[PDB]
Structure formats: structure tokens, C-alpha cells
């Protein structure tokens, strides 16, 4: 019971009824009730850079995200999120995370069609990987507050890239805008994702502000939460500014479910591999191969294997994921069984990992292992 | 161009040369594809007869 959401825009219909198209006196129309300790907190999502150089001073999404943050039931979890985020936006390790995921801030028809269909299929598998990853955090023992909107952002971006690749291949094959806008607004319906704080950045270059409902900032956040803490930055012998940022980094990394001594470095490169200090511990690479074999053979074998693995039952995986399907052969239907043929050397390694950290399962679904 | 040797006289020979392999291959293909389905149904249980039912 970590988080709950709603999608009916008629309960708090006063702040969205008229033409409230200005951040000026938007907080002045925000009181409107007995809201005193729950009115200025919802404005704090758009308070730093929501007027100071803001285009249009509002939009349809930027104001609807503020009144879907009903916090009247309890205001402790999102208060800890507002204290944890933006206390993390001080170190240069977060600054370089927002630079690798950002810019500076005939037969050729067959080749181009092959590029576009590869884009479609690769960005289409990962959406399914994330749809079977938001039912893993439905299990008891997980969280649903930081995990649920973080991996509902990535599936939307992968669905958009898949539709973009298919529209590109179709438009290129039938020859050698209104279609990409028709798939963009369609994914804006359904459920409603919970909010995360805004992560404003003020460095020597300027006052930047990212969104965390865009997949680039989400994809840049989990790369920051990867590495383990070193011999510095947590000891009480250089206590300069580290107990406010490294404690916040560790409480986010634990809120995902990762231990403080897990490394999890991204591996997508054209360079040489992870050398030896960022290279895994030979009971993790075997486990990662077991997870990749579970993903590659069925669309429903990751969540029950994680459910069994949290109970310490990770040797019983071969006989709990087996199920029977029919085969109409030349001698009648036979009802063979599909089962994940895990070897023993990767069935005991899943005993080494007690519970899969959600951060590991999100590098698994994004392709960084 | 002769009375006894017309020009269309190789036509019947080239039709008869083709039709000797066409119809025998068609019948042999029916025999193979009809026996082989019965082999692949019989020899799943009891695979000992696989070189005997060939």
C-alpha cells in the first residue's frame, strides 16, 4: 500500500474550470479551501522555474500534474521525496549524469528500412519488459511510490520510439506527422502516474530544470544510483557536505531495493569492456544470464521467478514455471510442456542473490547488463 | 519437310520425353509423402521400426 492514484478530473474541478492560464496568482487561486499545510506544498513543484523564464506560464500537462498531487490523505512520503530530491542536485556526479543522457545543453532503401524495423522491434521488446516489471513491484515487500512512475515513463518512450520506427519504415517503403501525433496523444490516456519532484539544477552555466516525466531524466537518474559508496563521502572524517547528499543517494538506492555494496555499472559502449573494478563477481554474471534466459523465452516468466526468489525458493524454479500446451501432431494432440531449462550452475547463483534489487531489474529491462 | 518426315515430328517425341519423368515423379511423390506421414505417426512411440518402416 505504498501509493494509489486516480484519473477523474472532476473532483478538484475548480482550479481547472475557468481560463486559469497564468502562473501569476495561480497560488492565489490555489488556496480556495481550508488548505493551509497542503496548498503551498503542491505549488512547490512549479515554484522555482515555473515563472522565471517559463514558456506560456502553464500548459495542459503542467497544471494537471499539480492538482493530481492530492496529498490530503498523508503528506509524509512526498515530503521526504521533496527533501531527498533537490538535495541530490548539488554534486558534479549528478551533473555528468545529465550530460551523457543529453545533448549540449536501390539497396539503400533496404538498408534504411532495416534500420527502421530494427528500431521498431528493439524499442518494442523493452516496453513489454517494463510492463512485466510494474507487476513485480506489485508483489509484497517492494515499493510502489518511487518504482511505479519511474518505469511507467520508460515504457511510454519505448512505445513512441517503436511507433516512430514503424511509421518511418512504412513511409520509406511506400515512397521509394499526423501519424506520430495520433500515437502520442493516445498513450496519454488510461491510468495516471504519480508525481516525482522536479530536480532543479543551478550551476555556473545557468538555472536548468528537468522533468522526470521525460525518459531522458529517468534514464539519467538510475545511472546515478548505480555505484556503491566508496571509502570517502560517508565517513565522519570529511563531514563537509556529504551527509546531506550521500545519505539521500543511499536512501534512494535502498528505496529501490539495492544494497549499499552493489555496483551495477552500465555496459552499453563501443569501447573496451568493464575493466576489472566495475566487472561483476562471477556469481552475478551467471545470475544475469539466468535473468536474460528467463526474459528471452516467455512473456510471463520473470514475475513468478522473482516471487519465488523472494521466498528463498530459488532452487524450485524449474518445476514451478513449467506449463503444458497442446501440439496437434500426426498422432493426435500430445500436450507437451514448456519449462525453463536452467542449469544447476545458474540455479544456485540465484540462491546467492537473496532478493533481486529493483535497480538491477531496471537495468535488465533497459539493456545495460 | 517430307511427306513422311514433317516439321512437327520432334514435337511428339519431346512431349513423350517430358511426360515419362513428370508422371512417374508425381506418383513417386504421392507414394513418398503418403508413406512418410504414416511413418512419422507410427514411430514416435516404438522408434525401433524406423529403419524397418522405410
Curated annotation (Swiss-Prot), chain B:
Molecular-function annotations in GO: proton transmembrane transporter activity; proton-transporting ATPase activity, rotational mechanism
Coarse class of the protein's main subcellular location: membrane
Keyword Membrane among record annotations: yes
Cytoplasmic topological segments: 32-53
Assigned GO CC terms: fungal-type vacuole membrane; Golgi membrane; membrane; proton-transporting V-type ATPase complex; vacuolar proton-transporting V-type ATPase complex; vacuolar proton-transporting V-type ATPase, V0 domain
Transmembrane segments: 9-31
Ranges of the Vacuolar topological domain: 1-8
Domain of life: Eukaryota
Single biological process term from Gene Ontology: intracellular copper ion homeostasis
Keywords from the UniProt entry: Hydrogen ion transport, Ion transport, Membrane, Transmembrane, Transmembrane helix, Transport, Vacuole
Subcellular localization: Vacuole membrane
Keyword Transcription regulation: no
Role played: Proton-conducting pore forming subunit of the V0 complex of vacuolar(H+)-ATPase (V-ATPase), a multisubunit enzyme composed of a peripheral complex (V1) that hydrolyzes ATP and a membrane integral complex (V0) that translocates protons. V-ATPase is responsible for acidifying and maintaining the pH of intracellular compartments.
UniProt record similarity statement: Belongs to the V-ATPase proteolipid subunit family.
Quaternary context: V-ATPase is a heteromultimeric enzyme composed of a peripheral catalytic V1 complex (components A to H) attached to an integral membrane V0 proton pore complex (components: a, c, c', c'', d, e, f and VOA1). The decameric c-ring forms the proton-conducting pore, and is composed of eight proteolipid subunits c, one subunit c' and one subunit c''.
Comment field (misc): Present with 8450 molecules/cell in log phase SD medium.
The protein's name in its UniProt record: V-type proton ATPase subunit c
Organism expressing this protein natively: Saccharomyces cerevisiae (strain ATCC 204508 / S288c) (Baker's yeast)
Record lineage: Eukaryota, Fungi, Dikarya, Ascomycota, Saccharomycotina
Gene this protein is translated from: VMA3
Stretch of the intact protein here: 1 to 54 of 160
Amino acid at each position: 500500500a505504498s501509493v494509489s492514484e486516480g484519473v477523474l478530473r472532476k473532483k478538484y474541478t475548480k482550479f481547472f474550470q475557468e481560463n486559469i492560464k497564468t502562473h501569476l496568482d495561480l497560488k492565489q487561486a490555489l488556496l480556495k479551501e481550508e488548505k493551509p499545510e497542503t496548498a503551498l506544498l503542491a505549488y512547490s513543484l512549479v515554484s522555482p522555474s515555473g515563472y522565471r523564464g517559463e514558456p506560456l506560464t502553464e500548459r495542459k500537462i503542467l497544471e494537471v500534474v499539480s492538482l493530481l498531487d492530492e496529498v490530503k490523505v498523508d503528506g509524509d512520503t512526498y515530503q521526504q521525496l521533496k527533501n531527498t530530491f533537490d538535495s541530490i542536485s548539488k554534486d558534479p556526479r549528478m551533473q555528468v549524469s545529465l550530460e551523457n543522457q543529453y545533448p549540449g545543453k536501390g539497396v539503400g532503401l533496404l538498408v534504411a528500412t532495416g534500420r527502421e524495423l530494427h528500431k521498431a522491434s528493439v524499442n518494442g521488446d523493452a516496453e513489454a519488459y517494463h510492463h512485466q516489471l510494474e507487476q513485480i513491484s506489485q508483489l509484497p515487500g517492494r515499493d510502489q511510490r518511487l518504482s511505479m512512475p519511474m518505469q511507467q515513463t520508460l515504457a511510454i518512450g519505448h512505445a513512441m520510439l517503436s511507433a516512430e520506427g514503424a511509421v518511418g519504415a512504412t513511409l520509406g517503403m511506400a515512397t521509394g506527422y499526423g501519424l506520430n501525433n495520433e500515437v502520442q496523444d493516445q498513450l496519454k490516456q488510461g491510468p495516471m502516474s504519480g508525481v516525482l519532484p522536479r530536480l532543479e539544477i543551478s550551476n555556473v552555466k545557468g538555472d536548468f530544470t528537468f522533468s522526470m516525466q521525460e525518459p531522458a531524466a529517468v534514464r539519467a537518474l538510475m545511472a546515478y544510483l548505480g555505484p556503491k559508496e566508496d571509502t570517502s563521502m560517508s565517513s565522519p572524517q570529511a563531514p563537509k557536505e556529504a551527509q546531506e547528499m550521500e545519505a539521500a543517494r543511499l536512501t534512494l538506492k535502498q528505496m529501490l531495493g539495492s544494497s549499499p555494496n552493489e555496483h551495477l555499472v552500465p555496459d552499453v559502449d563501443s569501447l573496451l569492456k568493464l575493466s576489472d573494478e566495475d566487472m561483476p563477481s562471477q556469481t552475478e554474471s551467471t545470475a544475469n544470464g539466468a535473468f536474460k534466459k528467463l526474459l528471452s523465452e516467455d512473456w510471463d516468466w520473470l514475475m513468478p521467478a522473482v516471487r519465488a526468489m523472494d521466498k528463498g525458493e530459488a532452487g524450485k524454479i524449474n518445476e514451478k514455471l513449467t506449463y503444458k500446451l497442446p501440439l496437434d501432431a500426426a498422432n493426435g494432440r500430445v500436450y507437451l510442456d514448456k519449462s525453463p531449462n536452467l542449469s544447476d550452475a545458474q540455479l544456485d547463483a540465484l540462491d546467492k542473490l537473496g532478493s533481486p534489487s529493483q535497480l538491477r531489474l531496471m537495468y535488465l529491462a533497459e539493456g545495460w547488463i | 519437310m517430307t511427306e513422311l518426315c514433317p516439321v512437327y515430328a520432334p514435337f511428339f517425341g519431346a512431349i513423350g520425353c517430358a511426360s515419362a519423368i513428370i508422371f512417374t515423379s508425381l506418383g513417386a511423390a504421392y507414394g513418398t509423402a503418403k508413406s512418410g506421414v504414416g511413418i512419422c505417426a507410427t514411430c514416435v512411440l516404438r522408434p525401433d521400426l524406423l529403419f524397418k518402416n522405410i
